[PDB]
Design a protein around this ligand. Sequence first.
Ligand SMILES: NC(=O)c1ccc[n+]([C@@H]2O[C@H](COP(=O)([O-])OP(=O)(O)OC[C@H]3O[C@@H](n4cnc5c(N)ncnc54)[C@H](O)[C@@H]3O)[C@@H](O)[C@H]2O)c1
Lengths: 355, 356
Amino acid sequence: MKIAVLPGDGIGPEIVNEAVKVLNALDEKFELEHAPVGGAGYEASGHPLPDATLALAKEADAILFGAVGDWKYDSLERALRPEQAILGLRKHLELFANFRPAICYPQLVDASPLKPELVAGLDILIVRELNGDIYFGQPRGVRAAPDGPFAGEREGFDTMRYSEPEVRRIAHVAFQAAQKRAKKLLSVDKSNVLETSQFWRDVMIDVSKEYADVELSHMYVDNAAMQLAKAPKQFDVIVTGNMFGDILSDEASMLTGSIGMLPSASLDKNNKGLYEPSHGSAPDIAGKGIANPLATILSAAMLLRYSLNRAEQADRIERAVKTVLEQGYRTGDIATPGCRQVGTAAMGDAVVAAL
Amino acid sequence: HMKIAVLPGDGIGPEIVNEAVKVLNALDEKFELEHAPVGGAGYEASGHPLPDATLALAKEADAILFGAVGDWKYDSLERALRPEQAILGLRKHLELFANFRPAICYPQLVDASPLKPELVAGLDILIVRELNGDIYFGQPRGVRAAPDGPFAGEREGFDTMRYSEPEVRRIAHVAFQAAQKRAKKLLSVDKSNVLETSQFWRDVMIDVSKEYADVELSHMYVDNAAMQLAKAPKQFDVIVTGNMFGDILSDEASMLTGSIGMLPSASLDKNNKGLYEPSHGSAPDIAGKGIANPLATILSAAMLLRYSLNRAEQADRIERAVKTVLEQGYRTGDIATPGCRQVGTAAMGDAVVAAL
Ligand SMILES: NC(=O)c1ccc[n+]([C@@H]2O[C@H](COP(=O)([O-])OP(=O)(O)OC[C@H]3O[C@@H](n4cnc5c(N)ncnc54)[C@H](O)[C@@H]3O)[C@@H](O)[C@H]2O)c1
């Protein structure tokens, strides 16, 4: 069991330090190896995904990833920008299936901006397609506009595209997840405007024929943004494209009390995965020792459960997180009245103590 | 001159526009109001939902006050003649590229929001959504055999996101000027850490910002913005973004206010001439029953004064009057609260007039 540990930029190192602390406190023997990624990759060898970092990730049984991004690197040419590291790991390792389990712990209901009755007992799974869409679609870039009223003018552009196999493989994953949960799947697209989305919807409906025990329904992304605020407990499994999943996921994280709570798994067809908190590198609080490590710690639990066949250890970590919340520990982003507010490292220590 | 084309439309349209006109006529001002048929009323008058004479009036006027078009009785017309085609026609022919979507939440109506009330009571933010371009209209688009890539040959759907320099520049100007008429904070939202269209958007936004140093420009990625709207919508003043992202964020913000039916809307051109309309559109189930809520249309008329006719003080006066009638307990059926004074459309309009 080799884990590639790729902390990245910003709050990445301080939150991954806590996840590694928790893994090291299990009785289990892991082989952990660190490598630079993102701005850290650029600093080391001028590329956000150094060849040796990609090699390590390919070789490992799983990847524990922090976050990438820092404003001082935004001006670099596109291929060198930090976020190209996570896009590249997803694409090169064919990690096409992203899982974001939004669960509101009882203690954190009061931390959510929504009225408490809307999020108490909330448990939604977002399945997001991760290797296609307008995130990768060609052609893209800047050009003279080839046609239309503004022909000749400078113009930025990206191509949104989805092919049949790409939609089918993520559809199957989502339907399989719904079979094991509440037998409901909601597919989100923008099919009343976008040709790509109508194509998505058509393929999703075709795959639904094979899952007579799951009820498939559909929702436009603009309505889904409304409904995640209004009545998110209507959802059990949501499946959507790369771009729409990105947008809805951050909104959904508020349903758990904070973006600092939402873990994620990115799997290939063999359940080799990269596990990362759903959030970014949070440069506004980077190095300040206050970021919430719990999304990253819960991502390490998912790592054990889904790639390393260690479901019992994953349960141990999850029980430890639930215990520290019962005990009153909170980082600043999930503070609740009367809580014990702690920084990143003390929160990690508390999780370790509760194992 | 201050000439306003009044295009009431169908069903609740005339009912609610009559109250906005009542409010305008109660001001000290000298407006030239001129009515013209649109939507189903356009079809009944001369066979098109946007008659030539109606478009000519809209072009000539300094602003347009528009109600709502559509009804069950028009839904059987051929597609090109349906009332809702007028909306598209006016936006295209008047080059209205800037969609103003206020998100406002009145304290009296705060329980309609899914948010805890301290986060949203008194919310007053503005989303400016580019309306004419983006991936919603970009060519090419359709379904094809994939031309290249890892899945070449497979059936594939596709769309093209694109924004040219003049398209971003003109929406940037409109948004920065709106921020000048407010708290001088503008947030631009994009996905420039992944999308080339978005980095291009950001670059042009920053170039225009050089002419508006009085306005504080900040940037946010669309996923963070969707979260921030739920977490703390009061942090914003004006938000500007592309068509698709704006569509999503504005609908989110409207749900977060709790009363999407109170919300005014506008579509503006490069001179800030606008068409001003309630956000809600038709309501066949209550059309002509005298109970539709006119407040969104009245608030649209206030927007009209503020952004097209250089009458910010009168706009403030109308917005003050709407706050007052809510404090006084007046409600139309859609926003009825326990112990309220429930009124129909006309009596609500009377109450706004009384509070001027
Ligand atoms: N997969 C990734 O690595 C990933 C994802 C998104 C953004 N990013 C990059 O992250 C950088 C910041 O982007 P952003 O500001 O839009 O998004 P972000 O998610 O880093 O931060 C959004 C907000 O949430 C707060 N936040 C995030 N994680 C937190 C935590 N664990 N504890 C407490 N507060 C937390 C931040 O302070 C900020 O206010 C950019 O460079 C962006 O490209 C990377």
